[PDB]
Design a protein around this nucleic acid. Sequence first.
DNA 1: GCCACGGCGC
DNA 2: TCGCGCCGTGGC
Length: 540
Amino acid sequence: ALEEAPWPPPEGAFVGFVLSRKEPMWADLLALAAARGGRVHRAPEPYKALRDLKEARGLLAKDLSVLALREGLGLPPGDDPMLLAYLLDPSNTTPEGVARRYGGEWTEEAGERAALSERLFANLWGRLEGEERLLWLYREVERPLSAVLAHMEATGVRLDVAYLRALSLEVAEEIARLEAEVFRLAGHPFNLNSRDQLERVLFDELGLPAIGKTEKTGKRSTSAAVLEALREAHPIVEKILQYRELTKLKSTYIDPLPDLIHPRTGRLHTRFNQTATATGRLSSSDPNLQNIPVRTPLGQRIRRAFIAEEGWLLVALDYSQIELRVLAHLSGDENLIRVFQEGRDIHTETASWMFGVPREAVDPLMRRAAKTINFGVLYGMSAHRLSQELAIPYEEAQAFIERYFQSFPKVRAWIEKTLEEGRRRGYVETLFGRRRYVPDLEARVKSVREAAERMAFNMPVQGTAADLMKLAMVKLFPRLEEMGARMLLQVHDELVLEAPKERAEAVARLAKEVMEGVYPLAVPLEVEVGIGEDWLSAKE
DNA sequence: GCCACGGCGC
DNA sequence: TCGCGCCGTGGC
Ligand SMILES: [Mg+2]
Ligand SMILES: [Mg+2]
């Protein structure tokens, strides 16, 4: 029968819990329960009952750990069947989906969530038997990383609220300028944020050619690609593109941020998820750091809003060209390995191979071509796309791509080898054995198959880079704790720390060493490090 | 409020 | 022709 016993539960019990909202730093803990041997213990008062647990063990353990940290408790996350499920198949991203797939039901009751957690753990543990690489990732990466991510989310980061107000005003003033010019050209006002109203203005009123159509609704598209053709010829088009860029930035990364400053901490608590992506990269939300513009002065001015506490400094560490380094390692291409061992400017050096010239004779446009292919090769960038990117003819783009593979032939071979592995086994894997299933390599529709192919050889590269970072995070954490420093943010191939100004230089030196030495590859791992009062200044 | 949707950032 | 999360729109 359904066994119940009073709170507190025995040691090693799985926990279940219900939040008032999904963000643990912002939620009330409504209910707390634990289960062992299928026997459920329900906490009369959940906040007091947290004190009784030595560990958060169960579904979404990291999230409960974040809320306990907020409350001044140290409840480190342990086993979590979500992490097992994600290793079995990274399409496993939510408790609901995991329950549906492997058994049971994700409900809204803490006791049931606790019992479910225990059953799923045993189930998924059994399904992993013999999978030694995935089990190594669980023990050395996923479980210990969950505790690091709890601390990052709970600690949060200070924002420069005066600066954000100044930036908001500047962007608002530019937006106002552009809409007035658009309304001047259209001869009347309308909602520039409405694609339906803009469609009418551009194509019916102004009579512009309508190239493409929308995916579902079957209307004339007003997308960037469709307007690109019209840009040079029609001023109103250019103004709309500028307008869209600024309003996207404002509404996503300027307007939301102060409301995310918690009343209790005086900090922004970015949420970090380790079971959200197909590749094994971490994701962030509230805000999504990954989608902050990387080019443009505007992306950079968002980062200036992120600041150190008074008396402290931010330390920013970035793995230079890590995906390309991983490609050199996985492919074993001797010439690409030479590019990295010569150890001068990587894109200049890549260009010298491609074009057959001494590095001194590589000009900035040749370098840009190499740099662009060094990014694009990783996912099969088309020659059409390269020709757009470089503003050169299609045939010349094709030639550049072939020049690249001629210099780096084992990269060409590795891509095909990886596709054969995917076709044979149904999955591809990273250096560490993180696995993604790739069923549509067999697809009949060429377009679907070719996207499947691109996802298939890109994942081992991105996923290896992801796990190198996560291992470094695991290794670095205890070394920072003992200096009074901490990790705050992770995005792309970058890690942002906060340290007291007196310890900042030593922390930079320690973190660089830990990151560069995390795992041996056929080429060196290189880390760029900078220190500053704000995140933009710490890029250096 | 819910949803699907276009559009765009990485 | 370069999947997913984000925003605002418009229908209900
Ligand atoms: Mg959509
Ligand atoms: Mg509405």
